[PDB]
CSV table of N, CA and C in Angstrom, one decimal:
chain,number,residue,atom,x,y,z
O,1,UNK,N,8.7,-18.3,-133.8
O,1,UNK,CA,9.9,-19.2,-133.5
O,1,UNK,C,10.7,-18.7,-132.4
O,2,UNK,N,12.0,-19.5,-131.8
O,2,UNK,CA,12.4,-19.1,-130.5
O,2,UNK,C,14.3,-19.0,-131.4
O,3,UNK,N,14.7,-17.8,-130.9
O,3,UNK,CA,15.8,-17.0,-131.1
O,3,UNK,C,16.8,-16.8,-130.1
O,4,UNK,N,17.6,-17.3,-129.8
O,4,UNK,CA,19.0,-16.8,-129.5
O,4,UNK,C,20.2,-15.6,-129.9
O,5,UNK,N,20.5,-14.9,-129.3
O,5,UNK,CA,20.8,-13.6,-129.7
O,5,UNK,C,22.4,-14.1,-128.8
O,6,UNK,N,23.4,-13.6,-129.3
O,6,UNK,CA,24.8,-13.4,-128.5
O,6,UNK,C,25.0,-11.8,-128.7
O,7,UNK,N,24.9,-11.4,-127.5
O,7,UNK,CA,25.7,-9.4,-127.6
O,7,UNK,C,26.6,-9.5,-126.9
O,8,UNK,N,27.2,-8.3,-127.0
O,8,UNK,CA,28.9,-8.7,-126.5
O,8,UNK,C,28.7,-6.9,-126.3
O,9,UNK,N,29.0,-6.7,-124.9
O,9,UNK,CA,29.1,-5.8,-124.0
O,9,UNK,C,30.3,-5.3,-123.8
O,10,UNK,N,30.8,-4.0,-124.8
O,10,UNK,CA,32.7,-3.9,-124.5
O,10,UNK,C,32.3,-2.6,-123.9
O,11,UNK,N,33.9,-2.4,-123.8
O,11,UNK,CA,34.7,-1.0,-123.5
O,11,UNK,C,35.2,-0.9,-123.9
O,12,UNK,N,34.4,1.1,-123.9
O,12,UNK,CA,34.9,2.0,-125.4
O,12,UNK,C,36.4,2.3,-124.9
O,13,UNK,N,37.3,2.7,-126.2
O,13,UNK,CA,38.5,2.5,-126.0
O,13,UNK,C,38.9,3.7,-124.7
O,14,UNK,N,39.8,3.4,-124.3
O,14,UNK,CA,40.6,4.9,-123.5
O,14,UNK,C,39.8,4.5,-121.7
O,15,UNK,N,38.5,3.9,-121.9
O,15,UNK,CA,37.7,3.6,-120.8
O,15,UNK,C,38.6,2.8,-120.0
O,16,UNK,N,39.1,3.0,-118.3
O,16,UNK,CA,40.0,1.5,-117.8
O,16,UNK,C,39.1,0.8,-117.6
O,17,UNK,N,40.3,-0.5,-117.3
O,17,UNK,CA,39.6,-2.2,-117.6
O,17,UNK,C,40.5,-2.9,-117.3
O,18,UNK,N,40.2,-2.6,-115.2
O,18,UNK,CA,41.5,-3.7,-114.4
O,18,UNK,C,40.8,-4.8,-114.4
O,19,UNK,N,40.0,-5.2,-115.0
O,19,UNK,CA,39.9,-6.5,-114.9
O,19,UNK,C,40.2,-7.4,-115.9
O,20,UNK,N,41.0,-6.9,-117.1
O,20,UNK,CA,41.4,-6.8,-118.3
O,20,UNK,C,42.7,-7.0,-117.9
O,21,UNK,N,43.2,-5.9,-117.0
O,21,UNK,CA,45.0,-6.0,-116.8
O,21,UNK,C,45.1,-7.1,-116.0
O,22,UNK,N,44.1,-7.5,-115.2
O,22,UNK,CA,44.5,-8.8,-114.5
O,22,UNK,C,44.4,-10.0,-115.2
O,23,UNK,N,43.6,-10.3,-115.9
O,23,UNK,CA,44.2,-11.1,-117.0
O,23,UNK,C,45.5,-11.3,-117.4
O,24,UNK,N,45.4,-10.2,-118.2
O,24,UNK,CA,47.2,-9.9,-118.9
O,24,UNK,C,48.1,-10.5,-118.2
O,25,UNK,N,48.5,-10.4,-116.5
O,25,UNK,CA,49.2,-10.5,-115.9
O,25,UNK,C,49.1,-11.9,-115.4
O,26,UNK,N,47.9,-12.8,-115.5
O,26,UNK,CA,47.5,-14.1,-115.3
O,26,UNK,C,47.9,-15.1,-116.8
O,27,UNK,N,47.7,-14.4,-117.7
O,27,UNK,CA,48.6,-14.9,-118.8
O,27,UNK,C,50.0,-14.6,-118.7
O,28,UNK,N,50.4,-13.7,-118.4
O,28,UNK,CA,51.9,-13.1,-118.4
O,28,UNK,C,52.4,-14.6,-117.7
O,29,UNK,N,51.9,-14.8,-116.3
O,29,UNK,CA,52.2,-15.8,-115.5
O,29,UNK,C,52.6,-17.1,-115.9
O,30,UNK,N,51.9,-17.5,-117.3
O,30,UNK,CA,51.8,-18.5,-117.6
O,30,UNK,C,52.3,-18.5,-119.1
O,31,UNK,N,53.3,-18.0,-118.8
O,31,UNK,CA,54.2,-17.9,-120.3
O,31,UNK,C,53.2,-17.9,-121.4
O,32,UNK,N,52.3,-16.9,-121.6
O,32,UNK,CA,51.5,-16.5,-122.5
O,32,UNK,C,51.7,-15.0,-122.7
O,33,UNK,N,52.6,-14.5,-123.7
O,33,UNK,CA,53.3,-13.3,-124.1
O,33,UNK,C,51.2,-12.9,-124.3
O,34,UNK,N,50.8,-11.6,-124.2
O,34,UNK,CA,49.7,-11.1,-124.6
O,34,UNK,C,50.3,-9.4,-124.4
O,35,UNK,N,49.7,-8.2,-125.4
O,35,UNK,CA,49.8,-7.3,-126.0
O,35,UNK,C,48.6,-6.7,-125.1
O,36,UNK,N,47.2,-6.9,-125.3
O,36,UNK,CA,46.0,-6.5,-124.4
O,36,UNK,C,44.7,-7.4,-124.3
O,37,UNK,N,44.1,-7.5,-123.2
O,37,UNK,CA,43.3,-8.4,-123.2
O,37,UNK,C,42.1,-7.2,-122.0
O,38,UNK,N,40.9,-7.1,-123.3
O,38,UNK,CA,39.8,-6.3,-122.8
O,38,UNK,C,38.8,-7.2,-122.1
O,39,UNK,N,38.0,-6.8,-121.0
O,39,UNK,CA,37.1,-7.6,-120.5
O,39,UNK,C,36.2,-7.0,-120.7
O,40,UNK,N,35.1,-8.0,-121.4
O,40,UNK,CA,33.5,-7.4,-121.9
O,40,UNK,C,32.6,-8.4,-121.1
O,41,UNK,N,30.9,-7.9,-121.1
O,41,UNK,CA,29.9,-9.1,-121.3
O,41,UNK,C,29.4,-9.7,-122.3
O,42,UNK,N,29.4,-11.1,-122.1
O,42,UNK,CA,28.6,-11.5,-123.3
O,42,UNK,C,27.3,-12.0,-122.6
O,43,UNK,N,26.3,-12.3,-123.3
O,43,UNK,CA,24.9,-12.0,-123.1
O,43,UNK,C,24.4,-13.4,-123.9
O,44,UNK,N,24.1,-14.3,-123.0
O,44,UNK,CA,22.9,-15.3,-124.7
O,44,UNK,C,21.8,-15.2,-123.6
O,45,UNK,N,20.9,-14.7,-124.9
O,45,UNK,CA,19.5,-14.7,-124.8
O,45,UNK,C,18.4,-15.1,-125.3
O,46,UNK,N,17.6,-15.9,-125.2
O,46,UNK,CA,16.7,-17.0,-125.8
O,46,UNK,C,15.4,-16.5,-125.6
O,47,UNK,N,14.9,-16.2,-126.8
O,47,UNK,CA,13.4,-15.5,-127.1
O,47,UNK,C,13.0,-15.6,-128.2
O,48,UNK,N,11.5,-15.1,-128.2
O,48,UNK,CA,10.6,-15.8,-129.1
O,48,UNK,C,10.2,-14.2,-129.9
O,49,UNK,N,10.0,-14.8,-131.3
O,49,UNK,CA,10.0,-13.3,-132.1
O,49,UNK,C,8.9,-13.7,-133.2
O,50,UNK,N,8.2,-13.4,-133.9
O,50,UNK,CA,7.5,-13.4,-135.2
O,50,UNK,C,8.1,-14.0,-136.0
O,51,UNK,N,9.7,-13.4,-136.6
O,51,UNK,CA,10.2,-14.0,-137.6
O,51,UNK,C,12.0,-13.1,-137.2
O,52,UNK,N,12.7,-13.3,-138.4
O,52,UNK,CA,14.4,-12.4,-138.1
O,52,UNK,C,14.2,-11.8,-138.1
O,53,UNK,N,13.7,-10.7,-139.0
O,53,UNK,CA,13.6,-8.9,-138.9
O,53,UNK,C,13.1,-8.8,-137.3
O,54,UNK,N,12.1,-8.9,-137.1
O,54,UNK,CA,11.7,-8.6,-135.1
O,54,UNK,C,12.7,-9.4,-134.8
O,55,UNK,N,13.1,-10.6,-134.9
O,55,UNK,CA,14.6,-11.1,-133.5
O,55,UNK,C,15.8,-10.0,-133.6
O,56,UNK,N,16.0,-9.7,-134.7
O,56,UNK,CA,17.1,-8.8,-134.7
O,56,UNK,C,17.0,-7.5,-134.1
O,57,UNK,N,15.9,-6.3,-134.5
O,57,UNK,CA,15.0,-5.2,-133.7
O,57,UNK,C,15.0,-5.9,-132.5
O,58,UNK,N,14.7,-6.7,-131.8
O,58,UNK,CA,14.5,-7.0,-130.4
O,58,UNK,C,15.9,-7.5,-129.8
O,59,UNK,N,16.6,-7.8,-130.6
O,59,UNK,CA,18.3,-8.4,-130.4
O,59,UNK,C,18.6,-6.7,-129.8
O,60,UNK,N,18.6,-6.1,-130.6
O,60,UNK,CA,19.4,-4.4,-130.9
O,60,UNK,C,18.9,-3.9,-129.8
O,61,UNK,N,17.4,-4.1,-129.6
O,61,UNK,CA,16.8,-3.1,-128.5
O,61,UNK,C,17.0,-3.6,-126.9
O,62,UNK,N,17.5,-4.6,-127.0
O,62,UNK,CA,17.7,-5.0,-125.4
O,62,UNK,C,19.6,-4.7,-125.5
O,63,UNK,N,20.1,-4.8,-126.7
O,63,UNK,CA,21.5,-4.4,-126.2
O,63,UNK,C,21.5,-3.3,-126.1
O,64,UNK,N,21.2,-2.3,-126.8
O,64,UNK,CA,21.2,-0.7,-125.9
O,64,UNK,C,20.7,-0.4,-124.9
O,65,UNK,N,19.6,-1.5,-124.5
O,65,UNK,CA,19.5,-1.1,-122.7
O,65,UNK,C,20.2,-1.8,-121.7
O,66,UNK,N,21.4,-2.5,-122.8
O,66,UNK,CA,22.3,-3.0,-121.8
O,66,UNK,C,23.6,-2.4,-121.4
O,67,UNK,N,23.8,-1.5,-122.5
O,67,UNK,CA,25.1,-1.1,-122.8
O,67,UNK,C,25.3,0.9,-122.1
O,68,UNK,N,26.8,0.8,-121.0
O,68,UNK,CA,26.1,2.5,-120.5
O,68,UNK,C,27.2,3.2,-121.5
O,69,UNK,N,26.4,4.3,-121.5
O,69,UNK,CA,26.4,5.5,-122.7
O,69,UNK,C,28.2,5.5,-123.1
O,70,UNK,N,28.3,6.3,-121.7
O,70,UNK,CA,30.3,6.5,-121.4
O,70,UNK,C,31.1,5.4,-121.3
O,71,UNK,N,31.2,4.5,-121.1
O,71,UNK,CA,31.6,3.2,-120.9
O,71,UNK,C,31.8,2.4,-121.6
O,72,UNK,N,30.6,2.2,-122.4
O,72,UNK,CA,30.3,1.0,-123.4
O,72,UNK,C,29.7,0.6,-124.7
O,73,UNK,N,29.6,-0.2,-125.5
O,73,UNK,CA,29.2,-0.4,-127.1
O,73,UNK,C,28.5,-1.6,-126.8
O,74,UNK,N,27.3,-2.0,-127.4
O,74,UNK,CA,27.0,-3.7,-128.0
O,74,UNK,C,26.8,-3.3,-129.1
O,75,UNK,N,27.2,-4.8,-129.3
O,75,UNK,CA,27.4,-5.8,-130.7
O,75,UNK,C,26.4,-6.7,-130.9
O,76,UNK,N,25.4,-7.3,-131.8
O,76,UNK,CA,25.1,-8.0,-131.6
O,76,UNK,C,25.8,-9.5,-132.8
O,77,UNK,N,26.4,-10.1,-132.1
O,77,UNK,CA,27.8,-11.1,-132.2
O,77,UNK,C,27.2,-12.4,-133.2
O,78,UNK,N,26.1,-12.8,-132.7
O,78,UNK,CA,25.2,-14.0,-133.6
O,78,UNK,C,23.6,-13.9,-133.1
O,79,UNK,N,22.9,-14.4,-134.4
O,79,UNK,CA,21.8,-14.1,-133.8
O,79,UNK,C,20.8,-15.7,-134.5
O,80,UNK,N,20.4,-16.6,-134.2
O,80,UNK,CA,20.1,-17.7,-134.3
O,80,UNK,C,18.8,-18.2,-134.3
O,81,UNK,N,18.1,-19.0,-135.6
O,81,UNK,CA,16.6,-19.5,-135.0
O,81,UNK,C,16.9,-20.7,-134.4
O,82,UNK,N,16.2,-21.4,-133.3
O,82,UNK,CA,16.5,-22.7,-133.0
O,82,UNK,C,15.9,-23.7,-133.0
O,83,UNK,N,16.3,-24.6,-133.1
O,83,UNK,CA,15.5,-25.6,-134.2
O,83,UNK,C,14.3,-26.1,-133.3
Z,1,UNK,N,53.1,-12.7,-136.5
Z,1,UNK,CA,52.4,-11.6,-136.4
Z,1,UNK,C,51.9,-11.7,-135.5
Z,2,UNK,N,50.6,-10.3,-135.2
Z,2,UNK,CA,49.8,-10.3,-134.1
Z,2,UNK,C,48.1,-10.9,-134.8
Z,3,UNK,N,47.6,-11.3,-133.7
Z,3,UNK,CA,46.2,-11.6,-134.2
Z,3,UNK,C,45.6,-10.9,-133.0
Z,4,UNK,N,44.1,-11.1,-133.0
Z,4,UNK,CA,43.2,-10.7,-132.1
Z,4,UNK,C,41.7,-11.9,-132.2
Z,5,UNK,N,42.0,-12.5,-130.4
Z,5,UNK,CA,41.2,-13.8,-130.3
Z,5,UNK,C,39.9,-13.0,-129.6
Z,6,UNK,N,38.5,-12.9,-130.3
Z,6,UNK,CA,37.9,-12.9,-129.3
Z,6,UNK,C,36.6,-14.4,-129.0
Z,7,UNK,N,37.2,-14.6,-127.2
Z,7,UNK,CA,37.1,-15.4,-126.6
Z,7,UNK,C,35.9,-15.4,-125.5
Z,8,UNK,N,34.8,-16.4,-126.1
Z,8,UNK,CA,33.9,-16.3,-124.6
Z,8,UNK,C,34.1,-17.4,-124.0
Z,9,UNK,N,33.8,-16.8,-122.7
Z,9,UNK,CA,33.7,-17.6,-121.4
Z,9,UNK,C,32.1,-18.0,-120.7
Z,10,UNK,N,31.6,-18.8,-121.2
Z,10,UNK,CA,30.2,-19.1,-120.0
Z,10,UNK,C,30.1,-20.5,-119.0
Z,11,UNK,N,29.4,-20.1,-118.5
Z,11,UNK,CA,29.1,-21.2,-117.6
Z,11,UNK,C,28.6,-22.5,-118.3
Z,12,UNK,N,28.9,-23.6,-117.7
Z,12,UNK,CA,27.9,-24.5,-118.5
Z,12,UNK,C,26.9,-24.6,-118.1
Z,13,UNK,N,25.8,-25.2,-118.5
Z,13,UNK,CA,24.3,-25.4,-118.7
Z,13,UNK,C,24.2,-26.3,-117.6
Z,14,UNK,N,23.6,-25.9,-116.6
Z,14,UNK,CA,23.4,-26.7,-115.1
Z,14,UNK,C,23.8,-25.9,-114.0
Z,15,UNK,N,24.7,-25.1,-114.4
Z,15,UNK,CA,25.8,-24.2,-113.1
Z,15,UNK,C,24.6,-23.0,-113.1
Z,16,UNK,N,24.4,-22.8,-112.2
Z,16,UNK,CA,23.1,-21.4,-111.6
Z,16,UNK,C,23.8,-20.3,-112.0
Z,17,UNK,N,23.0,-19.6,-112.7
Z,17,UNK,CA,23.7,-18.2,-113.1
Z,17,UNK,C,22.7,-17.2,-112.7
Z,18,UNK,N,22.9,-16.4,-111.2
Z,18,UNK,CA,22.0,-15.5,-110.7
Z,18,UNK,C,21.9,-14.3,-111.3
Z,19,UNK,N,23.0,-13.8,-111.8
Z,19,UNK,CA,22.8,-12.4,-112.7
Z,19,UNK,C,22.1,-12.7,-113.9
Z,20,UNK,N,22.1,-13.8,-114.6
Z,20,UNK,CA,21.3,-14.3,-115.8
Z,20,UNK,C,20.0,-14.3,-115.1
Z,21,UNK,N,19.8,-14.6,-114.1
Z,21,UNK,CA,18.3,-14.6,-113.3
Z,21,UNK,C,17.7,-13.6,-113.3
Z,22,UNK,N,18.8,-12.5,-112.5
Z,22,UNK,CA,17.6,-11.0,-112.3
Z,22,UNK,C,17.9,-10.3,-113.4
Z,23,UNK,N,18.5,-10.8,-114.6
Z,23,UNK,CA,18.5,-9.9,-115.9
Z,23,UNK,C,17.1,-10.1,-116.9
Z,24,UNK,N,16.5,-11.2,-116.4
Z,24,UNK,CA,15.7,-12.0,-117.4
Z,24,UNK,C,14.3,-10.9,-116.5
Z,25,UNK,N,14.6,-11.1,-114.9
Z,25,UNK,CA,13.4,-10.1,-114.5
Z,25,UNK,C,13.3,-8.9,-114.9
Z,26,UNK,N,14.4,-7.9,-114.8
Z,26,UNK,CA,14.2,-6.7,-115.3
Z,26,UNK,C,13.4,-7.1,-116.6
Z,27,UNK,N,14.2,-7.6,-117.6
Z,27,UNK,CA,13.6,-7.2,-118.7
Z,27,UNK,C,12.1,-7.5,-118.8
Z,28,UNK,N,12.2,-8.7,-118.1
Z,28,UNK,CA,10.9,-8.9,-118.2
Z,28,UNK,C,9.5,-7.3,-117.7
Z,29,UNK,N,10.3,-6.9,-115.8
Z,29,UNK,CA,9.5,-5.8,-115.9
Z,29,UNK,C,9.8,-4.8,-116.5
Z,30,UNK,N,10.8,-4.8,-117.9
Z,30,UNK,CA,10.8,-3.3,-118.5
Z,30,UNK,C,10.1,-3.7,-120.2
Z,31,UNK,N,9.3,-5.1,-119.5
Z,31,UNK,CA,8.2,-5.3,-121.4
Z,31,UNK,C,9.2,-5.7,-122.1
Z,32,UNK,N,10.2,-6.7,-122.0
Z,32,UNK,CA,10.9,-7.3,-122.8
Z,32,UNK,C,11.0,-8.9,-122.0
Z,33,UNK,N,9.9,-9.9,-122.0
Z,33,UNK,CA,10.1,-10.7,-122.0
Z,33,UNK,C,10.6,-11.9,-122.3
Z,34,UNK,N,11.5,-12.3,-122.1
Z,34,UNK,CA,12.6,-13.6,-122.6
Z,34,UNK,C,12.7,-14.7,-121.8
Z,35,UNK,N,13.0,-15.5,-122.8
Z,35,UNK,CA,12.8,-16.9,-122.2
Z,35,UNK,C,14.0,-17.7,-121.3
Z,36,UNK,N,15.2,-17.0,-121.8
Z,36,UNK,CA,16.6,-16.9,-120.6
Z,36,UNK,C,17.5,-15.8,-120.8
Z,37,UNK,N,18.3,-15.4,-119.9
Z,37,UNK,CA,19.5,-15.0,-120.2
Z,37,UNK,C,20.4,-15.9,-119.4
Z,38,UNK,N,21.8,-15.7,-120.4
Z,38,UNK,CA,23.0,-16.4,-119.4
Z,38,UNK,C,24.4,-15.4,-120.0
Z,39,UNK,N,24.7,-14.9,-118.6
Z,39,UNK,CA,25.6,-14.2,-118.4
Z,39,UNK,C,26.9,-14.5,-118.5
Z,40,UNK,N,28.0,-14.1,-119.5
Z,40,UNK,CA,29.2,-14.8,-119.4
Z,40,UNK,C,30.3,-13.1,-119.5
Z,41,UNK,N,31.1,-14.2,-120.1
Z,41,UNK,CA,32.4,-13.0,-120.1
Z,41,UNK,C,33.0,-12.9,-121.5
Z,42,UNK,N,33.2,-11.6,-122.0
Z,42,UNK,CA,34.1,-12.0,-123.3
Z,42,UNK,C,35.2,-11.3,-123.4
Z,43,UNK,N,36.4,-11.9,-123.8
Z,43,UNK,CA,38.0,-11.1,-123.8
Z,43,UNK,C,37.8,-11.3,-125.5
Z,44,UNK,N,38.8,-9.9,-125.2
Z,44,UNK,CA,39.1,-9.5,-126.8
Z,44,UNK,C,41.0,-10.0,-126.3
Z,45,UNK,N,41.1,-10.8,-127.1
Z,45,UNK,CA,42.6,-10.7,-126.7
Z,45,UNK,C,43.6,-10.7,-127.8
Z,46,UNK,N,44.6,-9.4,-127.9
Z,46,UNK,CA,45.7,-9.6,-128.8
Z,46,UNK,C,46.9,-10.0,-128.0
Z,47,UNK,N,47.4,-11.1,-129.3
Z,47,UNK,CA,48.8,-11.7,-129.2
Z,47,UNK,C,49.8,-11.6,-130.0
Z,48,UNK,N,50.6,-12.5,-130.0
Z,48,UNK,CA,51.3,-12.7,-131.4
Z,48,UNK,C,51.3,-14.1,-131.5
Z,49,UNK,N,51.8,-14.3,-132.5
Z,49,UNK,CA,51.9,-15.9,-133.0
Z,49,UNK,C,52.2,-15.9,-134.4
Z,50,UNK,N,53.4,-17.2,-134.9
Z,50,UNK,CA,54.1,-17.4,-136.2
Z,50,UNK,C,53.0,-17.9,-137.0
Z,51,UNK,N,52.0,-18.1,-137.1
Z,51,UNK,CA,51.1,-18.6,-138.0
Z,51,UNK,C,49.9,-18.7,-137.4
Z,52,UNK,N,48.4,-18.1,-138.3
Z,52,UNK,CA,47.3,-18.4,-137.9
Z,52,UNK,C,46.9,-19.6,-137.4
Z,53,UNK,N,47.6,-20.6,-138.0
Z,53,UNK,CA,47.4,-22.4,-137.1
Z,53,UNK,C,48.2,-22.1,-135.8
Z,54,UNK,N,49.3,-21.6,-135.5
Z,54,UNK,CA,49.3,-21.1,-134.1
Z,54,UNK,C,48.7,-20.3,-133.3
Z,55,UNK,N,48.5,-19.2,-133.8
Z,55,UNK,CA,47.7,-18.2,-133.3
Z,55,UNK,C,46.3,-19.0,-133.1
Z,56,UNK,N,45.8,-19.9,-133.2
Z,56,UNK,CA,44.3,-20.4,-133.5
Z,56,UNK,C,44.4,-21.4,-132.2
Z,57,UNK,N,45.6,-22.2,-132.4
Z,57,UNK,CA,46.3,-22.7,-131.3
Z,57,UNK,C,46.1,-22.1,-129.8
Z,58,UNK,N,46.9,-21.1,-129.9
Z,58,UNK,CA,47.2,-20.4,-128.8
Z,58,UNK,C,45.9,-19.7,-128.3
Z,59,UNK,N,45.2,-19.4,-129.2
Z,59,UNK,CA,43.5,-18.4,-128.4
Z,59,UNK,C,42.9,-19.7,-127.7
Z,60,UNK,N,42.6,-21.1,-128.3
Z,60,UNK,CA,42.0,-22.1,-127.4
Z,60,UNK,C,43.4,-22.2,-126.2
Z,61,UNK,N,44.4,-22.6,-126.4
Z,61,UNK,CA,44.9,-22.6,-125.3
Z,61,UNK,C,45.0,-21.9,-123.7
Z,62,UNK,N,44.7,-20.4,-124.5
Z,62,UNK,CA,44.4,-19.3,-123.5
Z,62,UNK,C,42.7,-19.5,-123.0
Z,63,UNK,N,42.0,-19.6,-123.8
Z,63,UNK,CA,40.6,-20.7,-123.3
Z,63,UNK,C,40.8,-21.8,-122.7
Z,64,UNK,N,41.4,-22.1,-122.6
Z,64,UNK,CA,41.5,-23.8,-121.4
Z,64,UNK,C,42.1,-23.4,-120.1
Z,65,UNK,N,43.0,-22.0,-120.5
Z,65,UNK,CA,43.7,-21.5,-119.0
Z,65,UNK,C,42.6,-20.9,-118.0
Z,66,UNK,N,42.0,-20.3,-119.1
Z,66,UNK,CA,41.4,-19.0,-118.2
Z,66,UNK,C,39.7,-19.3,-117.5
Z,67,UNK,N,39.5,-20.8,-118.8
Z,67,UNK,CA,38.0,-21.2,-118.2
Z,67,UNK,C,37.7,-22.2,-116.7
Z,68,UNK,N,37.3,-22.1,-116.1
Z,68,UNK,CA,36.9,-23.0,-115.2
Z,68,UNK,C,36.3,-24.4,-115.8
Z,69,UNK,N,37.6,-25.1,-115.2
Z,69,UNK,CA,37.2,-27.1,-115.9
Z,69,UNK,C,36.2,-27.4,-115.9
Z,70,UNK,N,35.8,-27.3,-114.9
Z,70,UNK,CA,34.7,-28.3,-114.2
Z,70,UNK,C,33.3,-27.4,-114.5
Z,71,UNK,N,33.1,-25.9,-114.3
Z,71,UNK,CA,32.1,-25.1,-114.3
Z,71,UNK,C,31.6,-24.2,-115.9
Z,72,UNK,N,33.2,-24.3,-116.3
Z,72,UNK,CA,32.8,-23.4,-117.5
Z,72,UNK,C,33.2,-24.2,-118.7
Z,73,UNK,N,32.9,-23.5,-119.9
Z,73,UNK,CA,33.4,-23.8,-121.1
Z,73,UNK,C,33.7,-22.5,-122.3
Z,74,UNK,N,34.7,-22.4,-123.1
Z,74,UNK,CA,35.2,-21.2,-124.1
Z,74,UNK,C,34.9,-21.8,-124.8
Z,75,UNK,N,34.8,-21.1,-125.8
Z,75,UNK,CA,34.9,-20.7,-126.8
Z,75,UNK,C,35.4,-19.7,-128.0
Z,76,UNK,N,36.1,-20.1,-129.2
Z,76,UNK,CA,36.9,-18.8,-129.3
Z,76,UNK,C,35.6,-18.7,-131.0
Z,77,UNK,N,35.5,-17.6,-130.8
Z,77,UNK,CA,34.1,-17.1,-131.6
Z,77,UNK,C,34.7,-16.5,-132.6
Z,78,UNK,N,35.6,-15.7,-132.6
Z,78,UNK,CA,36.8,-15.2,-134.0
Z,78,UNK,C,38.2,-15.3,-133.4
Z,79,UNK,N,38.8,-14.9,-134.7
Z,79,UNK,CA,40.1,-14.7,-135.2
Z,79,UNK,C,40.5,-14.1,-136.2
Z,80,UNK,N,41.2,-12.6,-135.9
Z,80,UNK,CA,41.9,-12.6,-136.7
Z,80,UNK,C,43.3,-11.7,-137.0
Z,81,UNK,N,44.3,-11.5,-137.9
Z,81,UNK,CA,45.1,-10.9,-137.8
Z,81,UNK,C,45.0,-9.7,-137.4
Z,82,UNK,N,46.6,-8.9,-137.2
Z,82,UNK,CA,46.4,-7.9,-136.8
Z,82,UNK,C,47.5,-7.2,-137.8
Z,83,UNK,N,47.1,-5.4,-138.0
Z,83,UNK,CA,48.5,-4.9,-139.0
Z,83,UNK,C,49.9,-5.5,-138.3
């Protein structure tokens, strides 16, 4: 069957993330009070797997080759058969 | 209270996504074959807001600001409070 995976690419805490403060300040702009606003990737990926156990294993195994060591974490956020 | 929206941002389906392009090649030359990728963005964003129907409010509204009309589309994928 064919699988859709969403991973979500952050930054580990303490890591900067001016692309994150520019936001903030793009909402500030726009009378939108915000506290912190982090910028991640998100990732949809559409592939074909045996069954869920392998979509998931293959979800996991391309987000750690997405994600760098110092920097960053994935998530794997939804993971979907499609119809 | 405070909540925490997190919000993706992708392209819509037609708009050329080149980094979804050469992502789908690596993988492919690193033996991980897939049938697309598409590259987006995701904000973790904390706010405040007098009720989860506003706070729920206000994460799409910060999604209408921040997406591109015409090119993109958000979505807010959770919610939820904050201590």
């Amino acid at each position: 069957p064919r699988y859709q995976a969403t991973l979500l690419i952050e930054l580990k805490k303490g890591i900067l993330d001016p692309q994150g403060r520019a936001v903030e300040g793009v909402l500030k702009d726009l009378g939108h009070p915000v506290e912190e606003v982090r910028v991640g990737k998100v990732l949809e990926i559409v592939f074909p797997a045996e069954n869920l156990l392998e979509a998931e294993e293959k979800a996991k195994a391309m987000g750690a080759l997405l994600a760098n060591p110092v920097m960053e974490v994935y998530a794997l956020e939804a993971l979907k058969e499609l119809p």
